[PDB]
Structure formats: structure tokens, C-alpha cells
Nucleic acid binder design. Structure first.
Ligand code: NA
Ligand code: NA
Length: 327
DNA sequence: CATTAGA
DNA sequence: TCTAATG
């Protein structure tokens, strides 16, 4: 956590570079397994060799540690940090829509700056044009203050459109968090659960609403179960316009909300724990159900859930508020 | 790890 | 169809 840090930290620098700038899926994969195990390791790595004894710990990497352990840095680490090209790839990646594959393609073309992206707005597909559009707004954080008014609106429509609709803004926001990165509404409805052959509209209906009224400005993507957009709070009585925010809405079977909702709330850690705990208490939990364990090694059979509670009671825990889903 | 774009 | 990109 702090004894192995620079080491794991430098490791991940390396990894993330292999995978992004280069297409070394493997090396990249290498640095990370290492970056992992050395992290577990309870003692201060004193040298290459000491490390080397570790699993996934090669000589290539061990070599890396010496230099790092010896001089406060790393040449390649220094060498990569500089490189406009790799530098350039690191940045374009930031534009919503741009992954590395594209990132690289763009570069080779000689698109390295934000402006390049501009002059060549033509080479970008919708997602990316939008990304490019709201570059400042997507990188900006979401105040709970705003989070509150936001949430406020999305509920009223939902409600207004149909009243049988259940919404839930999961995420950090849901867990207290003074700020969030993007709003995430969970969506269900009774007429939609597991077997019932869809009702895409269910999704569509709302998106229409939210748009109708001007909350959803743009669309990144809309499927019959996952809509991926952009929102905006009605700039009051002028002077103050609101930032463009990422909003994502997804349809769920009534019969799988709670686990799902459980899930999306986190924290990434609480889930595990909770998830690790269920294991003992005779269960399994995942993004959708909770199936009682059978000694033969494994087992199925989705137990029924009507609230966050059910999942809880099931595995025999204390209902932990979202506020407290911290870990 | 799954859903959507797009080519 | 595959292949990227997001969460
Ligand atoms: Na991006
Ligand atoms: Na292949």
C-alpha cells in the first residue's frame, strides 16, 4: 500500500504505456501481474533479485527495479514521459469516443492537438464529435448540488410518462459523494422482467420525454436497453449556463433491479466484501441475481428480491445504507 | 463483460 | 460479421 508503491507505481506506468502507445497486449499484461504481486508482498523490496523470486517477476522487470531502486527514477520512464507521440496518444484518448486504436490512427495522420481534431472534425464519428464538443464540460466534476436538481427532473418525467416506472440514480451520488462524474439512472418497470419479450419503447418513451423537455440535449447512443447521452440544467434566469453532463439510462427487468441496483451503488469494495460474504453464508451474488449454493461444487436457482433488504437478509447481513456502502 | 456503433 | 469504446 505504501511499502511497495513506486515499484508498483512505476510498473503500471510501463504497463499502461505498452497497451496504449504500443499494441503489446502481453507486455502490458506482464507489468500488471507483477505490478500486482509485488503489491501484495509485505516487505520492502530491496532489490531486483528479491523481487525476481516473485511470481510474474522476470528478469526484465527485475532489471527495472534495480535501476529504480538504485537511482530515484527510470530512463524509459523518463524517455516515454517526453515523447510527443506517445504523449499525444495519451491526450487524444481523453476525448469521449477516442480509444487508443483511434488515438494512434489519428496521430499517424498527424492529428495531435485539440485543434487538429477541429480542423478535421470531419474524420470523427458522432460520438467523438460530441466528445470533442463538450471537451471542457465532460472533464468537469458534477456537484451534488446540481446532482440533486438533476435527479429531481429525471424522476418527474419518468413519473409523468408512466407511473409504473421505477428510477434510481445509483453511483457515488447514491452513496453520499459530494460530487459525481456523470449521472447514472437505473431503470425498470413491472411490465419488464426476465421472460416478458421486451418493450423497447419502455426505454424510448422516456428518452423522448427528457429530450422533449430539453434535459437530454444530445445522444451518444441509444439501444433498446441502454441509452448513452448528454444532459443540461436549464440555465436559470441567465448569466449562468450549466455544464454539459454525461447521462446514462438503462432498462432493467423488474425481476433484477435490486441486485443490479445493489451493485451499481458499490462501492467497488463494498460489493466484493458483500460478495465475498454471501459465499460463505451459502451464496453467490452478481450484477443480476442471488443463487443458493449447492455443495456439489456449484449451484443455481435465482432467489426472489423486492428490496435492497432481501439481498441483505438473504446472506444474513445488517442493512447497510447507501451512505455507508463505503466498504 | 456487455451493449451499441460502424464499416 | 468484427472491432472499438464506454461503463
Ligand atoms: Na476517450
Ligand atoms: Na482474432
Amino acid at each position: 500500500e505504501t511499502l511497495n508503491g513506486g515499484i508498483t507505481d512505476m510498473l503500471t506506468e510501463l504497463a499502461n504505456f505498452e497497451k496504449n502507445v504500443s499494441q503489446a497486449i502481453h507486455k502490458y499484461n506482464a507489468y500488471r501481474k507483477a505490478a500486482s504481486v509485488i503489491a501484495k508482498y509485505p516487505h520492502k523490496i530491496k532489490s531486483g533479485a528479491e523481487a525476481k523470486k516473485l511470481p510474474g517477476v522476470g528478469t526484465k522487470i527485475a532489471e527495472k527495479i534495480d535501476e529504480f531502486l538504485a537511482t530515484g527514477k527510470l530512463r524509459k520512464l523518463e524517455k516515454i514521459r517526453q515523447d510527443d507521440t506517445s504523449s499525444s496518444i495519451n491526450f487524444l484518448t481523453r476525448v469521449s469516443g477516442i480509444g487508443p486504436s483511434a488515438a494512434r490512427k489519428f496521430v499517424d495522420e498527424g492529428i495531435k492537438t485539440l485543434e487538429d481534431l477541429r480542423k478535421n472534425e470531419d474524420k470523427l464519428n458522432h460520438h467523438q464529435r460530441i466528445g470533442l464538443k463538450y471537451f471542457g464540460d465532460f472533464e468537469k466534476r458534477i456537484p451534488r448540488e446540481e446532482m440533486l436538481q438533476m435527479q429531481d427532473i429525471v424522476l418527474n418525467e419518468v413519473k409523468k410518462v408512466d407511473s409504473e416506472y421505477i428510477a434510481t440514480v445509483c453511483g457515488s451520488f447514491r452513496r453520499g459523494a459530494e460530487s459525481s462524474g456523470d449521472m447514472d439512472v437505473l431503470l425498470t418497470h413491472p411490465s419488464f422482467t426476465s421472460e416478458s419479450t421486451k418493450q423497447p419503447k419502455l426505454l424510448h418513451q422516456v428518452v423522448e420525454q427528457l429530450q422533449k423537455v430539453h434535459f437530454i440535449t444530445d445522444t451518444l447512443s441509444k439501444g433498446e436497453t441502454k441509452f448513452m447521452g448528454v444532459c443540461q440544467l436549464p440555465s436559470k434566469n441567465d448569466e449562468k449556463e450549466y455544464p454539459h453532463r454525461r447521462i446514462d439510462i438503462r432498462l432493467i427487468p423488474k425481476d433484477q433491479y435490486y441486485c443490479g441496483v445493489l451493485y451499481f451503488t458499490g462501492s467497488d469494495i463494498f460489493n466484493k466484501n458483500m460478495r465475498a460474504h454471501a459465499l460463505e453464508k451459502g451464496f453467490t451474488i452478481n450484477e443480476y441475481t442471488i443463487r443458493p449454493l449447492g455443495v456439489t461444487g456449484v449451484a443455481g436457482e435465482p432467489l426472489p428480491v423486492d428490496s435492497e433488504k432481501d439481498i441483505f437478509d438473504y446472506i444474513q447481513w445488517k442493512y447497510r445504507e447507501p451512505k455507508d456502502r463505503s466498504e
